[PDB]
Amino acid sequence: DRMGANFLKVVNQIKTRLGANPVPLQLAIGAEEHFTGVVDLVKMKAINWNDADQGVTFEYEDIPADMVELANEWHQNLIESAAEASEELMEKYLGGEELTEAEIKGALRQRVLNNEIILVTCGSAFKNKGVQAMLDAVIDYLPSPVDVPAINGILDDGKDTPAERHASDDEPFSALAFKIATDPFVGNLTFFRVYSGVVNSGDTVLNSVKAARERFGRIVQMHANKREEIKEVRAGDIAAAIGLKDVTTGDTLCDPDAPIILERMEFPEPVISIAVEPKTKADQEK
Amino acid sequence: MKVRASVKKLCRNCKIVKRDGVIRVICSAEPKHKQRQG
Amino acid sequence: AKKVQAYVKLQVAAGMANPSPPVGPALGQQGVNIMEFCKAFNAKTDSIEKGLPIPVVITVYADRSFTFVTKTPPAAVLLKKAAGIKSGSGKPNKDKVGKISRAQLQEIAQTKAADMTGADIEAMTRSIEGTARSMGLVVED
Amino acid sequence: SRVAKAPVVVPAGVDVKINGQVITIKGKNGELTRTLNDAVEVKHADNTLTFGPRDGYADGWAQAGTARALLNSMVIGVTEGFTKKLQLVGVGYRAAVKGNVINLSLGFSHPVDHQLPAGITAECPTQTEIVLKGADKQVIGQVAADLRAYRRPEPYKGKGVRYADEVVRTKEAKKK
RNA sequence: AGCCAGGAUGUUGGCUUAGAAGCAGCCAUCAUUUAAAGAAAGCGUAAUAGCUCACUGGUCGAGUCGGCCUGCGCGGAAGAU
């Protein structure tokens, strides 16, 4: 909703600078100030938004008459994007079997596990124009923890046997340690995410890469700000693996007699170095 | 336009024309080389 | 040959494949693949013992084309290839070290006579005596 | 002089109305008249126009030296014309022609739409390029320079409105 | 004085070569062709590509140019019922 904001320029600028292959889907209706419609091209439906409300309507209509031909020349490039994704849609682009909304995404979802095309969407966050539109693609173009290759614990030093473990609750427990913040209540905190398996409350969770013993305290979830005590952590939640005695960047959070990860890749280098000096001589003690 | 009593032809391509009577000296790329009095 | 578009003669010792930064721009004038000028000259560079600056000229053409002329190394660096040091000009008329007679100068001029139409034998002889006096070198025969 | 060695050749298709000091040129698409000063002696001699400085006003070599350059431009301006293109380099800045009015997307809290006088057929191939067409050499610059004076060429980015042939000198920040 | 107009081309011009590559600066300060070119004036610039001065080589086809002396003129020149 700004001047100079050409949607078709930027997505066709990626093919020049970033060198990628983007085929966009949700196009633009409106001259950026009277902007009212976002042109979803699979279902060929424009969406009405709020007069100025923080979120009332979702009214779907047809393609408006002021863009009846740009929808024509851009939908035919959408339905190209499955004939060269899977080899089986090659003979019905030319034969003329109908390219429905549901059929084309079954090929393009498998085009996200290799990542040759990215899926683009224009709209406004602040003007409440597109946010309610942007959620339905996440369940259909962004991958799930059970649709991906799951936890792959290799071994330790014996042999390189990468083992795809299960994404369900039927595995040994596994997690990782990252975003390990602090607090003046308990000391150390984490923002950890469990990939599969279920843990109960109270566990001898180790950190099996650095040979240390830790015990699993009272886990707390947030609204990104507020303390909500999560007792039973299910497979896929993100919480605070509290009470770790020592913890490093990206080591395992795993019960013994189980698969084990040992992985720390791209340890950075903080470059600019400034020397802090105390104010009082009581300060250098603290 | 800086003012000073001396208009000295300073830049290599410095035009001089008498607009209104008071001399002001015309460079091309340098705005710094333009005086007006004298 | 050509005109106000482009004509600069700059090439230094051809043991270095990568275009040296100051030479870069004479290759950075009319859109070359810099791998092409590396692959053009190396078929004949394996007939030399490298160490002297060998010159080429660049000359251009309309679409994406270009051309270049191969000659022999100049006698100015041939004066200071035999003399051992590459830079002797510290004081021209106050240094008297190092002699080469005219016979060396003409046999490095036959390779000019077998390559180029200017830089003739007898006319360059005083300038190959003139690059000696500026370096502070002596000549006798 | 050089101007005295410069007579102007009127072609067929442009008619002169010599009422002495007042000449009204009947041309192709307009009427380019100039009421000159009395330091001139005008005569459309055969076809090539000849002029002369009047006595007393011996500085009329200047005052008709303007005129020799003047009427040459007038007979070629009423027929062929001037392409005066301007280059809009501004973040979110557009240009669009309707009737005889130009919009000015000029980074303000309010739109500026100024109506442009006669002797102007303006056009706009895009949001950054804008044609101006005219018959007098003065009017093809005067309406052009007013737009350029609303947003002068900024010499830290290259921002501003600028002519087609004009080349700015943009500098560098050099401190922060 | 302008439009075409080559900026004929030996060379990297050293030093000290990291670039001080005609264009940072000290000593030389020759010129292969001299109907047009200096081992050189600035900008582009770490260096150069870009743009010129150099001779205007070809067109206009007549006057033109830089200083010395005086007659006068302009600026310099802003004050308080």
From Swiss-Prot, chain A:
Subcellular location: Cytoplasm
Source organism of the structure: Escherichia coli (strain K12)
Gene name per UniProt: fusA
Official protein name in the record: Elongation factor G
Domain of life: Bacteria
Functional note: Catalyzes the GTP-dependent ribosomal translocation step during translation elongation. During this step, the ribosome changes from the pre-translocational (PRE) to the post-translocational (POST) state as the newly formed A-site-bound peptidyl-tRNA and P-site-bound deacylated tRNA move to the P and E sites, respectively. Catalyzes the coordinated movement of the two tRNA molecules, the mRNA and conformational changes in the ribosome.
Family: Belongs to the TRAFAC class translation factor GTPase superfamily. Classic translation factor GTPase family. EF-G/EF-2 subfamily.
UniProtKB/Swiss-Prot annotation, chain B:
Keyword Heme in annotation: no
Recorded GO CC terms: cytoplasm; cytosolic large ribosomal subunit
Record's keyword terms, sorted: Ribonucleoprotein, Ribosomal protein, RNA-binding, rRNA-binding
Biological process terms in GO annotation: cytoplasmic translation; translation
PROSITE patterns, sorted: RIBOSOMAL_L36
Iron-sulfur is among the record's keywords: no
One of the record's GO molecular function terms: rRNA binding
InterPro entries, alphabetized: Ribosomal_bL36, Ribosomal_bL36_sp
SUBUNIT field: Part of the 50S ribosomal subunit.
Protein family membership: Belongs to the bacterial ribosomal protein bL36 family.
Function: One of the last ribosomal proteins to be assembled in the 50S subunit, it contacts a number of helices in the 23S rRNA, acting as molecular glue. The simultaneous presence of uL16 and bL36 probably triggers ObgE's GTPase activity and eventual dissociation from the mature 50S ribosomal subunit.
Name of the molecule in the record: Large ribosomal subunit protein bL36A
Curated annotation (Swiss-Prot), chain C:
Residue positions where N,N,N-trimethylalanine is found in the record: 1
CDD domains: Ribosomal_L11 (cd00349)
In-chain residues carrying the UniProt-annotated modification N6-succinyllysine: 71, 80
A GO term, aspect molecular function: rRNA binding
N6,N6,N6-trimethyllysine modifications at: 3, 39
Keyword annotations from UniProtKB, A to Z: Methylation, Ribonucleoprotein, Ribosomal protein, RNA-binding, rRNA-binding
Pfam families: Ribosomal_L11 (PF00298), Ribosomal_L11_N (PF03946)
Protein's GO biological process: cytoplasmic translation; ribosomal large subunit assembly; stringent response; translation; translational termination
Gene Ontology cellular component terms for the protein in this record: cytoplasm; cytosol; cytosolic large ribosomal subunit
Role of this protein: Forms part of the ribosomal stalk which helps the ribosome interact with GTP-bound translation factors.
PANTHER family the record matches: 60S RIBOSOMAL PROTEIN L12, LARGE RIBOSOMAL SUBUNIT PROTEIN UL11M
Assembly description: Part of the ribosomal stalk of the 50S ribosomal subunit. Interacts with L10 and the large rRNA to form the base of the stalk. L10 forms an elongated spine to which 2 L12 dimers bind in a sequential fashion forming a pentameric L10(L12)2(L12)2 complex.
HAMAP family: Ribosomal_uL11 (MF_00736)
Record family assignment: Belongs to the universal ribosomal protein uL11 family.
Name this polypeptide is given: Large ribosomal subunit protein uL11
Organism lineage: Bacteria, Pseudomonadati, Pseudomonadota, Gammaproteobacteria, Enterobacterales
Gene coding for it: rplK
Swiss-Prot record, chain D:
Disulfide bonds: none
UniProt-listed GO biological process terms: cytoplasmic translation; response to antibiotic; ribosomal large subunit assembly
SUPFAM superfamilies: Ribosomal protein L6
Modified residues (N6-acetyllysine): 43
Gene3D superfamilies: Ribosomal protein L6, alpha-beta domain
Gene Ontology MF term list: large ribosomal subunit rRNA binding; structural constituent of ribosome
Acetylation as UniProt keyword: yes
Keywords: Acetylation, Antibiotic resistance, Ribonucleoprotein, Ribosomal protein, RNA-binding, rRNA-binding
Pfam families xref list: Ribosomal_L6
InterPro entries: Ribosomal_uL6-like, Ribosomal_uL6-like_a/b-dom_sf, Ribosomal_uL6_a/b-dom, Ribosomal_uL6_bac-type, Ribosomal_uL6_CS
Cellular component annotations (GO), alphabetically ordered: cytoplasm; cytosol; cytosolic large ribosomal subunit
Function text: This protein binds directly to at least 2 domains of the 23S ribosomal RNA, thus is important in its secondary structure. It is located near the subunit interface in the base of the L7/L12 stalk, and near the tRNA binding site of the peptidyltransferase center. Gentamicin-resistant mutations in this protein affect translation fidelity.
Quaternary assembly: Part of the 50S ribosomal subunit.
Protein family (similarity comment): Belongs to the universal ribosomal protein uL6 family.
Record protein name field: Large ribosomal subunit protein uL6
Organism: Escherichia coli (strain K12)
Taxonomic lineage: Bacteria, Pseudomonadati, Pseudomonadota, Gammaproteobacteria, Enterobacterales
Name of encoding gene: rplF
